[PDB]
Design an enzyme around this catalytic site. Structure first.
Site, PDB file in Angstrom:
ATOM      1  N   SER A  98      -1.497   1.969  18.479  1.00 33.20           N
ATOM      2  CA  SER A  98      -0.421   1.975  17.458  1.00 33.20           C
ATOM      3  C   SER A  98       1.002   2.099  18.046  1.00 33.20           C
ATOM      4  O   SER A  98       1.951   2.000  17.259  1.00 33.20           O
ATOM      5  CB  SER A  98      -0.702   3.050  16.411  1.00 33.20           C
ATOM      6  OG  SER A  98      -0.553   4.351  16.963  1.00 33.20           O
ATOM      7  N   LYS A 141       2.338  10.367   9.725  1.00 29.74           N
ATOM      8  CA  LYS A 141       3.331   9.753  10.654  1.00 29.74           C
ATOM      9  C   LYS A 141       4.705   9.649   9.967  1.00 29.74           C
ATOM     10  O   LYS A 141       5.734  10.015  10.591  1.00 29.74           O
ATOM     11  CB  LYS A 141       2.842   8.386  11.144  1.00 29.74           C
ATOM     12  CG  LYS A 141       1.827   8.409  12.284  1.00 29.74           C
ATOM     13  CD  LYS A 141       1.228   7.045  12.535  1.00 29.74           C
ATOM     14  CE  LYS A 141       0.280   6.995  13.713  1.00 29.74           C
ATOM     15  NZ  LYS A 141      -0.308   5.642  13.857  1.00 29.74           N
TER      16      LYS A 141
HETATM   17  C1  LIG Z   1      -0.107   5.593  22.239  1.00 32.51           C
HETATM   18  C2  LIG Z   1      -0.153   6.473  20.982  1.00 32.51           C
HETATM   19  C3  LIG Z   1       1.179   7.155  20.682  1.00 32.51           C
HETATM   20  C4  LIG Z   1      -0.617   5.621  19.806  1.00 32.51           C
HETATM   21  C5  LIG Z   1      -1.013   6.390  18.552  1.00 32.51           C
HETATM   22  N1  LIG Z   1      -2.054   7.339  18.953  1.00 32.51           N
HETATM   23  C6  LIG Z   1      -2.387   8.373  18.159  1.00 32.51           C
HETATM   24  O1  LIG Z   1      -1.873   8.588  17.062  1.00 32.51           O
HETATM   25  C7  LIG Z   1      -3.481   9.281  18.641  1.00 32.51           C
HETATM   26  C8  LIG Z   1      -4.618   9.364  17.628  1.00 32.51           C
HETATM   27  C9  LIG Z   1      -5.334   8.034  17.618  1.00 32.51           C
HETATM   28  C10 LIG Z   1      -5.198   7.175  16.522  1.00 32.51           C
HETATM   29  C11 LIG Z   1      -5.846   5.944  16.511  1.00 32.51           C
HETATM   30  C12 LIG Z   1      -6.653   5.593  17.588  1.00 32.51           C
HETATM   31  C13 LIG Z   1      -6.809   6.464  18.673  1.00 32.51           C
HETATM   32  C14 LIG Z   1      -6.157   7.681  18.684  1.00 32.51           C
HETATM   33  N2  LIG Z   1      -2.980  10.628  18.797  1.00 32.51           N
HETATM   34  C15 LIG Z   1      -2.835  11.182  19.996  1.00 32.51           C
HETATM   35  O2  LIG Z   1      -3.115  10.569  21.008  1.00 32.51           O
HETATM   36  C16 LIG Z   1      -2.286  12.572  20.140  1.00 32.51           C
HETATM   37  C17 LIG Z   1      -1.458  13.124  19.169  1.00 32.51           C
HETATM   38  N3  LIG Z   1      -0.967  14.367  19.351  1.00 32.51           N
HETATM   39  C18 LIG Z   1      -1.274  15.085  20.446  1.00 32.51           C
HETATM   40  C19 LIG Z   1      -2.097  14.546  21.424  1.00 32.51           C
HETATM   41  N4  LIG Z   1      -2.580  13.304  21.255  1.00 32.51           N
HETATM   42  B1  LIG Z   1      -1.556   5.339  17.426  1.00 32.51           B
HETATM   43  O3  LIG Z   1      -2.773   4.457  17.756  1.00 32.51           O
HETATM   44  O4  LIG Z   1      -1.855   5.970  16.068  1.00 32.51           O
HETATM   45 NA    NA Z   2       2.121   4.996  16.667  1.00 36.91          NA
END
Ligand SMILES: CC(C)C[C@H](NC(=O)[C@H](Cc1ccccc1)NC(=O)c1cnccn1)B(O)O
Ligand code: NA
Ligand SMILES: CC(C)C[C@H](NC(=O)[C@H](Cc1ccccc1)NC(=O)c1cnccn1)B(O)O
Ligand code: NA
Lengths: 188, 196
Positions: A98, A141
């Site tokens: 994301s 978010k």
């Molecule tokens: C590279 C990152 C910032 C992208 C975002 N990641 C997150 O929100 C992820 C959750 C997620 C959501 C979907 C698929 C896999 C993991 N969150 C985290 O990595 C996270 C958030 N707070 C503290 C430590 N780790 B996104 O995919 O929602």
């Molecule tokens: Na994101």
């Protein structure tokens, strides 16, 4: 304090109702050689397993960066001309697809030296054809972006729901394409 | 950046259609193959004995490149990126004909009928080998609004004849897959036409 070159506000979620804003930093320098891509602060690999079986892959975050570089080539950029380093400060282990639109915006900004609006946060998976794909945790978010003092939050078109219209005190912009993201955030 | 409609099964009877993205550009250096969205390695067994191997998905990509080589294409002339969208690790040999069609289409520009979905393992000689979950795959193709689904000849069975509202095409070879999914390219401002 100011719009700035290669600083972009991404968003994360940890479990159902817990969001946060991350200040992603992008550095681009004329390549020493063949060009390079490096990322600090992400998972490199994921493993998923059972009792007797497991698989391993490069992380969705690392995969996301490769999609980003493919999109920038289709737009006529040559990332091979640059050593590119993306940093997720703090040392927190993060993963997921994301941040694709945020990293793409960060690299575009760093290459063109065009600052990004510091009042905007964004979340969005990027496809190889520049489309912005739906993500998880869009409410937590948006609340994290608001809670952090963002005036605007960019979300994928397909994450639009009626309930979003009920959120006060932050402009929610739905996008279908990475070009629409660049339109919203680049300053002059 | 071209799309091919692949198919997957998760548990006994759930199917989904995957819009697989294929980018092919003139090689920046020595050319390259990159895949996103797949399992890369699998470990099977226990403490006492286990093996590790390239995933079935990665093996499928290697077979695809060999077939395109045996067909007189030079995949090493290109940087090729295939993206399996979203955030689930996908694995299996059954997207072989989808990935090969997507690369073919991208190299020759000859675009892909967007109403077609497909499933099939590809062999080195370019035969289309049987896959699993053919019934949920067909049903998922129908639900997604596909008008046609390509399956392996050895997956043909009587009961598929009971499925309405989608054309089921059984193929033996990759050339047959291409005969069925490739559309006559546009004819405007061309010195000659290519017909399928
Ligand atoms: C590279 C990152 C910032 C992208 C975002 N990641 C997150 O929100 C992820 C959750 C997620 C959501 C979907 C698929 C896999 C993991 N969150 C985290 O990595 C996270 C958030 N707070 C503290 C430590 N780790 B996104 O995919 O929602
Ligand atoms: Na994101
Ligand atoms: C590369 C993918 C799309 C190929 C297809 N894979 C799947 O259907 C596999 C199941 C499978 C079947 C046979 C052998 C190994 C694993 N399904 C998935 O990976 C899957 C399905 N839905 C959501 C997420 N992942 B195929 O081998 O049936
Ligand atoms: Na398949």
């Amino acid at each position: 304090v100011e719009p700035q070159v290669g600083i972009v506000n991404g968003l994360a979620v940890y479990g159902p109702n817990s969001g946060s804003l991350l200040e992603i930093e992008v550095s681009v320098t004329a390549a020493q050689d063949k060009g390079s891509i490096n990322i600090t602060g992400i998972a490199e690999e994921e493993s998923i397993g059972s009792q007797s079986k497991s698989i391993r892959r490069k992380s969705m975050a690392k995969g996301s960066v490769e999609n980003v570089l493919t999109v920038l080539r289709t737009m006529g950029m040559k990332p091979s001309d640059y050593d590119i380093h993306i940093n997720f400060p703090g040392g927190i282990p993060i993963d997921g697809p994301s941040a694709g639109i945020a990293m793409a915006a960060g690299i575009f900004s760093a290459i063109h030296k065009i600052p990004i609006d510091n009042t905007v946060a964004m979340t969005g998976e990027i496809s190889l054809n520049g489309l912005v794909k739906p993500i998880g945790g869009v409410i937590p978010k948006i609340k994290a972006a608001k809670q952090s003092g963002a005036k605007k939050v960019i979300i994928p078109y397909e994450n639009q729901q009626a309930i979003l219209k009920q959120i006060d005190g932050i402009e929610i912009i739905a996008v279908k394409t990475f070009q629409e993201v660049l339109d919203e955030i680049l300053v002059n």
